[PDB]
């Protein structure tokens, strides 16, 4: 038996493990602490080492020896990295031309750790949590990255996993990885265009994916390293400052530990109020020896966060314009990440888009899953498909001659009754491809119009004529557009009852 293969979503704020059971479904591997999305944090208390939400607990108490958000510093030198992102955690220093961190071990001795060392020992117990649940050793994994990591980072992730003995067998982009599990659980009845939304704690990722006969392709991607759940969190930090200084006449912002425990207890409400209408905060010894008790509902939270949430809908708008699409054309918006649990962010997207876009989120009655989980579950699905392959076959499958498919830029289709353009094979379609349209109610003699199509900001405008075909005294017809590997367009129009078929060739 080959080694088990698992999927890794490595995130700024959370990491998750997925694995395909012998019952051939997805199962989420949890940590020993019982939380599925393991946080990406390490805290050293002397010689002892802590991970996860346990390691996030010492951030308020020992912030100089607690590290966080170490995904964006991998593979690139320190001068291209913003140090103030981990200004709340451990300082990031200059180590060997890349980013390193200053830690303190037992007896006050100082150890200088590379960020390459960080990912290895983070994956050390991501290995341990996976093999304890499954009961067998793991050696290889599929790692999901954002699409803006270059190849020199991917080799560094391959190298740092090789420091501990993990073989990163494949790299896949997170919008491509997250969508597959949604497509496996809920297959699409029609070929659609969808937008993957990854709203993390410290960064926001949006990418536009065309779903064409099971092939997932980039139209355009967008990233914002400044928009995220931290801005949701920091807006509440100044919010909780407001009632505290009017009631108790103290400034909680001027103490780092007071601001950290305020930042810690505000971080819980982002998860807590995603499922309930209100949340309560009780903090012993906040600042100047003062306790604090307050209850905050959904509506005043949304009244606070309407500036940031409008930026989140604005970030959706820019990636559509970057690929030059119209929000009438887009079929769905797919959501992943812990920010996507918020029901306010769900409601903004039906308002700022047409009603024909179905927003795939936690609130959806028909197509819903866990947004923090949906990235990793797609990686295990790719893991199961490649589990039959050795390294030679998958690397040959990874070759640019094979992974590059030519597509079709300008869409084709059928002309309507009033001269409107009805696309059959849409835009952005790879070939060879064949689609069937059943005109069952078609009675009489028909002229079948094949035209190229032009799209503008959305009505379809009739474009360049491809061919024309006609049928006589027909009672139900099928229209077939066939494109081969050579780009030749062949159109078959078959009568549904008599079998009288007229074939067009180009």
């Amino acid at each position: 038996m080959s080694s088990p293969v698992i999927g890794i979503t490595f995130g700024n704020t959370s990491s998750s493990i997925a694995y395909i059971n012998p019952k051939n479904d997805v199962d989420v591997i949890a940590n020993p602490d019982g939380e599925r999305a393991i946080p990406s944090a390490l805290s050293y208390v002397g010689e002892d080492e802590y991970h996860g939400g346990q390691a996030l607990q010492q951030l308020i108490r020992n912030p100089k020896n607690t590290i966080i958000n170490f995904r964006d510093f991998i593979g690139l030198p320190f001068d291209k990295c913003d140090v103030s992102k981990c200004a709340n955690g451990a300082p990031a220093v200059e180590v060997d031309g890349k980013v390193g961190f200053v830690i303190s071990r037992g007896e006050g001795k100082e150890e200088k750790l590379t960020v390459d060392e960080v990912v290895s020992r983070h994956l050390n117990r991501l290995k341990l949590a996976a093999e304890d649940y499954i009961g067998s050793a793991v050696k290889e994994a599929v790692l999901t990255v954002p699409t803006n990591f270059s190849e020199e980072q991917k080799t560094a992730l391959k190298a740092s996993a090789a420091k501990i003995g993990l073989q990163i067998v494949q790299f896949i982009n997170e919008p491509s990885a997250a969508l597959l599990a949604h497509a496996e659980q809920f297959p699409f009845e029609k070929d659609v265009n969808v937008v993957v939304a990854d709203f993390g704690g410290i960064r926001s990722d949006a990418a536009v994916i065309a779903v064409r006969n099971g092939i997932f392709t980039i139209l355009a991607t967008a990233h914002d390293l400044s928009l995220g759940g931290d801005n949701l969190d920091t807006e509440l930090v100044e919010y909780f400052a407001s009632e505290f200084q009017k009631k108790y006449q103290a400034n909680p912002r001027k103490n780092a530990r007071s601001l950290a425990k305020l930042k810690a207890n505000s971080s819980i409400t982002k998860k807590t109020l995603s499922n309930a209408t209100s949340a309560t905060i009780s903090i012993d010894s906040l600042a100047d020896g003062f306790d604090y008790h307050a209850s905050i509902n959904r509506m005043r939270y949304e009244l606070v966060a309407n500036k940031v949430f409008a930026q989140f809908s604005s970030f959706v708008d820019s990636v559509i314009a970057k690929a030059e699409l119209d929000p009438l054309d887009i079929d769905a918006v797919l959501l992943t990440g812990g920010v996507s649990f918020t029901p306010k962010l769900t409601t903004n997207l039906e308002y700022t888009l047409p009603e024909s876009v179905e927003i795939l989120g936690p609130q959806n009655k028909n197509a819903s899953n866990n947004p923090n989980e949906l990235a990793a579950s797609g990686a295990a699905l790719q893991a199961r498909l490649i589990s039959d392959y050795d390294a030679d076959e998958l690397a040959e499958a990874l070759q640019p001659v094979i992974v590059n498919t030519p597509h079709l830029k300008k869409p084709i289709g059928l002309i309507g009754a009033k001269g409107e353009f009805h696309p059959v094979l849409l835009a952005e379609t790879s070939f060879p491809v064949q689609k069937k349209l059943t005109l069952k109610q078609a009675k009489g003699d028909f002229l079948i119009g094949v035209y190229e199509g032009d799209h503008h900001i959305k009505l379809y405008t009739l474009g360049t004529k491809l061919m024309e075909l006609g049928i006589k005294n027909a009672n139900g017809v099928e229209i077939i557009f066939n494109i081969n590997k050579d780009g030749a367009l062949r159109v078959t129009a078959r009568d549904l009852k008599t079998g009288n078929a007229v074939k067009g060739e180009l």
Binding site: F216, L381, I386, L408, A417, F446, L447, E452, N482, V502
Partner: protein
């Protein structure tokens, strides 16, 4: 889904220039999806490997069947695809295996790539692939034998002059393959006794047809459906079955009742 222009000009002439790759674009895609792992596999793996052979088709009897889709395969005739258009239902199980071994080397996709053929013939190969498991299954072949309208010989035309034993001769074996009862009474000749005629029509009046219609299911139960959707398709699919059972049985009754008067 909307209406059609419905024009009476009825032209079947292409007027534009040849299809260029200027509206064709070529950036790569991400290696993800189960259909990536098959679309790559056709250009990566592409794995493919006597008195009874005199009964086969030497050349493909339906030339249009080569261009037919693998997805639209249920309207495709598998007997013309297998090379058994002469014999159809009466071919044995080993004959299907020998016919499958003939057609796998004639239409080898690597040899089709060697002969310069397109990938459209590989779509006909997926017809050739799953025809084998359909025709080696006892149920699935019999289900395909239940819908073989090409082998369904019609009764002869009304108002014409014909021999009764020669024109209705091959007709009654078309449903005798659907007989659950053995032995099969024969039509006989002009010198047949009255008791044999009474034993004939009673067999056809009390006829037992095993013909089913699961292959005519346009909607099939998907495994991605929930519990009510697999039930909802089945009652509709049964409603197609018994209607086509009773109508063909009434057609068979009219097949019985016309031969009595003629």
């Amino acid at each position: 889904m909307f209406s059609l222009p419905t024009l009476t000009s009825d032209i079947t002439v292409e007027v534009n220039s040849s299809a260029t790759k200027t509206p064709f674009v070529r950036r790569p895609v991400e290696p993800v999806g189960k259909f990536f792992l098959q679309h790559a596999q056709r250009t990566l793996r592409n794995h493919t490997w006597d008195p009874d052979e005199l009964l086969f088709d030497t050349e493909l009897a339906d030339e249009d069947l080569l261009t037919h889709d693998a997805r639209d395969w249920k309207t495709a005739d598998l007997y013309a695809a297998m090379g058994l258009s002469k014999l159809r239902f009466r071919a044995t199980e080993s004959q299907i295996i020998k016919a499958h071994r003939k057609q796998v080397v004639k239409y080898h996709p690597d040899k089709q790539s060697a002969a310069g053929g397109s990938l459209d013939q590989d779509g006909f190969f997926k017809i050739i692939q799953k025809a084998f498991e359909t025709l080696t299954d006892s149920n699935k072949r019999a289900q395909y034998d239940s819908c073989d309208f090409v082998a369904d010989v019609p009764p002869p035309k009304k108002g014409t002059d014909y021999d009764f034993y020669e024109a209705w001769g091959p007709v009654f074996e078309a449903e005798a393959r659907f007989s659950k009862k053995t032995p099969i009474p024969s039509l006989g000749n002009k010198d047949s006794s009255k008791k044999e005629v009474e034993q004939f029509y009673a067999f056809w009046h009390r006829f037992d047809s095993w013909r089913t219609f699961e292959f005519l299911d346009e909607d099939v139960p998907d495994d991605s459906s929930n519990r009510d959707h697999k039930r909802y398709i089945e009652r509709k699919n049964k409603a197609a079955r018994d209607k086509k059972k009773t109508a063909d049985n009434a057609r068979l009754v009219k097949l019985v009742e016309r031969a009595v008067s003629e």
